[PDB]
Design an enzyme around this catalytic site. Structure first.
Site, PDB file in Angstrom:
ATOM      1  NE  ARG A  45       0.391   1.368   0.788  1.00 17.38           N
ATOM      2  CZ  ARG A  45       1.819   1.281   1.716  1.00 17.38           C
ATOM      3  NH1 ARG A  45       1.858   0.361   2.931  1.00 17.38           N
ATOM      4  NH2 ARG A  45       3.338   1.468   1.748  1.00 17.38           N
ATOM      5  CB  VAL A  51      -3.623   9.396  -0.985  1.00 17.47           C
ATOM      6  CG1 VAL A  51      -3.881  11.590  -1.827  1.00 17.47           C
ATOM      7  CG2 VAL A  51      -4.500   8.459  -1.913  1.00 17.47           C
ATOM      8  CG  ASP A 151     -16.310   3.526  -2.800  1.00 17.50           C
ATOM      9  OD1 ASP A 151     -17.033   3.145  -2.387  1.00 17.50           O
ATOM     10  OD2 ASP A 151     -14.766   3.932  -3.061  1.00 17.50           O
TER      11      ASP A 151
END
Length: 324
Positions: A45, A51, A151
């Site tokens: 998470r 996920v 990211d």
């Protein structure tokens, strides 16, 4: 105020696109069949989603389902659709509405990944070059399509080491690059944040991802995790300055007419630029070469406009030994 900045490559790709390409707010999601997928195990998470490993019962293929916890949804979906099929870009297989969360669930192809920590312990010199080159293919494609990931970090690179297969994942922070646009500096993970973020310069570009890649490379070739080890976002810049030096930092902020947060006055100090040899030792020397150091040196520059672009990086002698 601060002097403006523009990307030195792929500057205008979105301006020459139909509105539809980048106007993610207007995108209409095409929904699939939620009952096609059975959740098998929760993988994790994050801040914005949970996920799952799942199975597509309409073919028995293993898939990954990200159930989203506004408009970031359509942005991620649009970017994923725009980039789909690109080299080493994770494939969005489907989008369904989860019946329990009543939010979109993104369905991705599965990648048999090895934990980067366990996998950074084993990479040979050759494999570092090989996989770096693969990540560069993804970044060159993304930028050529007008997208910055924002990211880049080891957690967002999925590697199937057995098949020597790599995917760049989690485009939930990604954005469309528009010349002259100001962006949120609260992106990326602390240890991978470019100096532009740490000095609150908002008019950044694809070159942010190249800094992050450089920080990854430094950690790998020097066996130092992370390479720049800050306790917070301020100390993070000080850690960088202890390596790259403060004079070049001041040159950078001076160029863009940026003023440092005054809280740096008592913590930044005065630091010379270090030679990369400082970080070489008996445990990491086999991963270091003149080509590696020169390549790293050209990624880890304060001035975002001075870093190698993804394609320039792919041209570097460090990659001459990679079989293509």
């Amino acid at each position: 105020g601060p002097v403006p900045s523009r990307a030195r490559v792929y500057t205008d790709v979105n301006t020459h696109r139909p509105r539809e390409y980048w106007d993610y707010e207007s995108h209409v999601v095409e929904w699939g069949n939620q009952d096609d997928y059975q959740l098998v195990r929760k993988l994790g998470r994050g801040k914005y989603s949970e996920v799952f490993e799942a199975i597509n019962i309409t073919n028995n293929e293993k898939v990954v389902v990200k159930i989203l916890k506004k408009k970031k949804i359509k942005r991620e979906i649009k970017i994923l659709e725009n980039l789909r099929g690109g080299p080493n870009i994770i494939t969005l297989a489907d989008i369904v509405k989860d019946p329990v969360s009543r939010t979109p669930a993104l369905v991705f192809e599965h990648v048999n990944n090895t934990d980067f920590k366990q996998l950074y312990q084993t990479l040979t010199d050759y494999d570092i070059r090989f996989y770096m080159y693969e990540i560069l293919k993804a970044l060159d494609y993304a930028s050529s399509m007008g997208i910055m990931h924002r990211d880049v970090k080891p957690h967002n690179v999925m590697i199937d080491h057995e098949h020597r297969k790599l995917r760049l994942i989690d485009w939930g922070l990604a954005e469309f690059y528009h010349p002259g646009q100001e962006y949120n500096v609260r992106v990326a993970s602390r240890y991978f944040k470019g100096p532009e973020l740490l000095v609150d310069y908002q008019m950044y570009d694809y070159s942010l991802d190249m800094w992050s890649l450089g920080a990854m490379l430094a950690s790998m070739i020097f066996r130092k995790e992370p390479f720049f080890h800050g306790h917070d976002n301020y100390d993070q810049l000080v850690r960088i300055a202890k390596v790259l030096g403060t004079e070049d930092l001041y040159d950078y902020i001076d160029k863009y007419n940026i003023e440092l947060d005054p809280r740096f006055n008592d913590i930044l100090g005065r630091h010379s630029r270090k030679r990369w040899e400082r970080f070489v030792h008996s445990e990491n020397q086999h991963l270091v070469s003149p080509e590696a150091l020169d390549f790293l040196d050209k990624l880890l520059r304060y001035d975002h406009q001075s870093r190698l672009t993804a394609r320039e990086a792919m041209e570097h002698p460090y990659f001459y030994t990679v079989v293509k």
